[PDB]
Design an enzyme around this catalytic site. Structure first.
Site, PDB file in Angstrom:
ATOM      1  N   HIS A   1       0.883  -1.238   0.016  1.00  0.00           N
ATOM      2  CA  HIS A   1       0.044  -0.096   0.088  1.00  0.00           C
ATOM      3  C   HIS A   1       1.009   1.339   0.059  1.00  0.00           C
ATOM      4  O   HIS A   1       0.922   2.105   0.907  1.00  0.00           O
ATOM      5  CB  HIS A   1      -0.884  -0.064   1.270  1.00  0.00           C
ATOM      6  CG  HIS A   1      -2.028  -1.106   0.958  1.00  0.00           C
ATOM      7  ND1 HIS A   1      -1.967  -2.277   1.685  1.00  0.00           N
ATOM      8  CD2 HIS A   1      -2.981  -0.862   0.382  1.00  0.00           C
ATOM      9  CE1 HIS A   1      -3.038  -3.102   1.026  1.00  0.00           C
ATOM     10  NE2 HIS A   1      -3.902  -1.960   0.525  1.00  0.00           N
TER      11      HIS A   1
ATOM     12  N   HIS B   1       1.872   1.478  -5.673  1.00  0.00           N
ATOM     13  CA  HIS B   1       0.386   1.350  -5.650  1.00  0.00           C
ATOM     14  C   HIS B   1      -0.364   2.248  -5.999  1.00  0.00           C
ATOM     15  O   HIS B   1      -1.385   2.299  -6.946  1.00  0.00           O
ATOM     16  CB  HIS B   1      -0.323   0.624  -4.324  1.00  0.00           C
ATOM     17  CG  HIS B   1      -1.706   0.265  -4.578  1.00  0.00           C
ATOM     18  ND1 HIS B   1      -2.332  -0.739  -5.216  1.00  0.00           N
ATOM     19  CD2 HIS B   1      -2.669   0.720  -3.585  1.00  0.00           C
ATOM     20  CE1 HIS B   1      -3.430  -0.555  -4.838  1.00  0.00           C
ATOM     21  NE2 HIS B   1      -3.831   0.178  -3.947  1.00  0.00           N
TER      22      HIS B   1
ATOM     23  N   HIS C   1      -5.913   7.285  -3.189  1.00  0.00           N
ATOM     24  CA  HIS C   1      -6.853   6.569  -2.548  1.00  0.00           C
ATOM     25  C   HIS C   1      -6.370   5.834  -1.438  1.00  0.00           C
ATOM     26  O   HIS C   1      -7.217   5.425  -0.669  1.00  0.00           O
ATOM     27  CB  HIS C   1      -7.678   5.519  -3.745  1.00  0.00           C
ATOM     28  CG  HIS C   1      -6.651   4.266  -3.939  1.00  0.00           C
ATOM     29  ND1 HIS C   1      -5.506   4.401  -4.293  1.00  0.00           N
ATOM     30  CD2 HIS C   1      -6.874   3.280  -3.190  1.00  0.00           C
ATOM     31  CE1 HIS C   1      -5.159   2.977  -4.589  1.00  0.00           C
ATOM     32  NE2 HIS C   1      -5.877   2.095  -3.749  1.00  0.00           N
TER      33      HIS C   1
HETATM   34  C1  LIG Z   1     -14.497 -10.104   6.276  1.00  0.00           C
HETATM   35  C2  LIG Z   1     -12.909 -10.804   5.832  1.00  0.00           C
HETATM   36  O1  LIG Z   1     -13.358 -11.919   5.174  1.00  0.00           O
HETATM   37  C3  LIG Z   1     -12.552 -12.304   4.079  1.00  0.00           C
HETATM   38  O2  LIG Z   1     -11.499 -12.860   4.085  1.00  0.00           O
HETATM   39  N1  LIG Z   1     -12.789 -11.995   2.501  1.00  0.00           N
HETATM   40  C4  LIG Z   1     -11.998 -11.744   1.617  1.00  0.00           C
HETATM   41  S1  LIG Z   1     -12.127 -10.579   0.505  1.00  0.00           S
HETATM   42  N2  LIG Z   1     -10.713 -12.664   1.727  1.00  0.00           N
HETATM   43  C5  LIG Z   1      -9.362 -12.657   0.868  1.00  0.00           C
HETATM   44  C6  LIG Z   1      -9.095 -11.715  -0.060  1.00  0.00           C
HETATM   45  C7  LIG Z   1      -7.726 -12.063  -0.828  1.00  0.00           C
HETATM   46  N3  LIG Z   1      -7.167 -10.780  -1.506  1.00  0.00           N
HETATM   47  C8  LIG Z   1      -6.278 -10.650  -2.437  1.00  0.00           C
HETATM   48  O3  LIG Z   1      -5.568 -11.817  -2.316  1.00  0.00           O
HETATM   49  C9  LIG Z   1      -5.784  -9.268  -3.119  1.00  0.00           C
HETATM   50  C10 LIG Z   1      -6.133  -7.972  -2.769  1.00  0.00           C
HETATM   51  C11 LIG Z   1      -7.006  -7.444  -1.495  1.00  0.00           C
HETATM   52  O4  LIG Z   1      -7.757  -8.149  -0.875  1.00  0.00           O
HETATM   53  N4  LIG Z   1      -6.670  -6.132  -0.981  1.00  0.00           N
HETATM   54  C12 LIG Z   1      -7.091  -5.520   0.248  1.00  0.00           C
HETATM   55  C13 LIG Z   1      -5.907  -4.833   0.494  1.00  0.00           C
HETATM   56  C14 LIG Z   1      -5.606  -4.912  -1.005  1.00  0.00           C
HETATM   57  C15 LIG Z   1      -5.685  -6.900  -3.921  1.00  0.00           C
HETATM   58  N5  LIG Z   1      -5.168  -7.922  -4.706  1.00  0.00           N
HETATM   59  N6  LIG Z   1      -5.173  -9.112  -4.325  1.00  0.00           N
HETATM   60  C16 LIG Z   1      -4.464 -10.087  -4.987  1.00  0.00           C
HETATM   61  C17 LIG Z   1      -7.215 -13.076  -0.449  1.00  0.00           C
HETATM   62  C18 LIG Z   1      -7.451 -14.236  -0.029  1.00  0.00           C
HETATM   63  C19 LIG Z   1      -6.794 -15.605   0.228  1.00  0.00           C
HETATM   64  N7  LIG Z   1      -8.916 -13.961   0.841  1.00  0.00           N
HETATM   65 MG   LIG Z   2      -7.196   1.065   0.356  1.00  0.00          MG
HETATM   66 ZN   LIG Z   3      -5.542   0.526  -2.750  1.00  0.00          ZN
END
Ligand SMILES: CCOC(=O)NC(=S)Nc1cc(NC(=O)c2c(C(=O)N3CCC3)cnn2C)cc(C)n1
Ligand SMILES: [Mg+2]
Ligand SMILES: [Zn+2]
Length: 313
Positions: A68, A72, A106
């Site tokens: 972040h 990014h 952002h």
């Molecule tokens: C309420 C929480 O519950 C839950 O786990 N829900 C969910 S969205 N889980 C989740 C989300 C992942 N996200 C990513 O890998 C990712 C992001 C991302 O999420 N973010 C947030 C900051 C940037 C951006 N690019 N990539 C590749 C991976 C896995 C295994 N699990």
């Molecule tokens: Mg953000």
């Molecule tokens: Zn972002």
């Protein structure tokens, strides 16, 4: 006023493509951003001196976290630039101005922790903003920087044009709260399939700008495989730090965030592409046909994560 930014030939051409990587030379990223405002908006949208001062203060207020970070910020702005350029005529003079600024801003002053970690840590910011905690912070930091001396890049807008563009930027930054993405996409799905989607309806535009923001925010999944894979490492370096901090508060983290559960990364990428990425770029491509390359590149990377699972790499 006759001072066009230009890029070396390979960048000049590759920057128009959705899957462009801004590269490892930090000192070129400000120039890349200005180039995109000039082509996307015009060479007259912003007083150059004010813009350059704004960019350098925005950069200063991103922190040295694995993911972040200032890179990014510019990567997310470049994705928005590609969307705007492939849908020339759908966006007002003001949205074009506002959305590259929103994207650059952002994640201002992000510390590499989710809203959940702040709420469980009991961070002051969780008392001040009960939902979309970091995102209200990022907008707050955007307004701070706009109010520094010599930093008002919007100074030649009318008072109401100014209020519209700060309102475009605030909804755009709030929309990067992925908790909000799900409902926003469901509603866009229904609206598009039942035929009620109306781009003249300001509340409808709002939703379509929110989906663009999710898409640009997730654009690491739409890069060529080697870029996607090496970014995933940065993304998980923050997740695992957050898991460590969760353990320090006496809380088992979700496995995504547990560094002892690295073997489960490939299967968690599948979940994410299936539950989040593919649905996001699907609904986006339906609403904005020219964004299809984002969907196709996301599907390529999903297929690359399945090959990781099959021990084929
Ligand atoms: C309420 C929480 O519950 C839950 O786990 N829900 C969910 S969205 N889980 C989740 C989300 C992942 N996200 C990513 O890998 C990712 C992001 C991302 O999420 N973010 C947030 C900051 C940037 C951006 N690019 N990539 C590749 C991976 C896995 C295994 N699990
Ligand atoms: Mg953000
Ligand atoms: Zn972002």
């Amino acid at each position: 006023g006759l001072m066009q930014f230009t890029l070396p030939v390979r960048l000049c051409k590759e920057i128009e493509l959705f899957h462009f990587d801004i590269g490892p030379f930090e000192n070129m990223w400000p120039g890349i951003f200005v180039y995109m405002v000039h082509r996307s908006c015009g060479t007259s949208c912003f007083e150059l001196e004010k813009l350059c001062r704004f960019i350098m203060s925005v950069k200063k207020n991103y922190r040295r976290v694995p993911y972040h970070n200032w890179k990014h910020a510019v990567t997310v702005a470049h994705c928005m630039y590609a969307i705007l350029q492939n849908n020339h005529t759908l966006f007002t003079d003001l949205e074009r101005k506002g959305l590259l600024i929103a994207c650059l801003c952002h994640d201002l002053d992000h510390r590499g922790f989710s809203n959940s970690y702040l709420q469980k840590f009991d961070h002051p910011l969780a008392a001040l903003y009960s939902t979309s905690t970091m995102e209200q912070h990022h907008f707050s930091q955007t307004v701070s920087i706009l109010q520094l001396e010599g930093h008002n890049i919007f100074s030649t807008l009318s008072s109401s044009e100014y209020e519209q563009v700060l309102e475009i930027i605030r909804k755009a930054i709030i929309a990067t709260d992925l908790a909000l993405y799900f409902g926003n996409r469901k509603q866009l799905e229904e609206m598009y399939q039942t035929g009620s989607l109306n781009l003249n309806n300001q509340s409808h535009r709002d939703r379509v700008i929110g989906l663009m923001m999710t898409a640009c925010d997730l654009c690491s999944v739409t890069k060529l495989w080697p870029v996607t894979k090496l970014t995933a490492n940065d993304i998980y370096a923050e997740f695992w730090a957050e898991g460590d901090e969760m353990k320090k508060l006496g809380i088992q983290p979700i496995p995504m965030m547990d560094r002892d559960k690295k073997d489960e990364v490939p299967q968690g990428q599948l979940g994410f592409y299936n539950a989040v990425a593919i649905p996001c770029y699907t609904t986006l491509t339906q609403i904005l046909p020219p964004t299809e390359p984002l969907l196709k590149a996301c599907r390529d990377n999903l297929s690359q994560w399945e090959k990781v699972i099959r021990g084929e790499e």
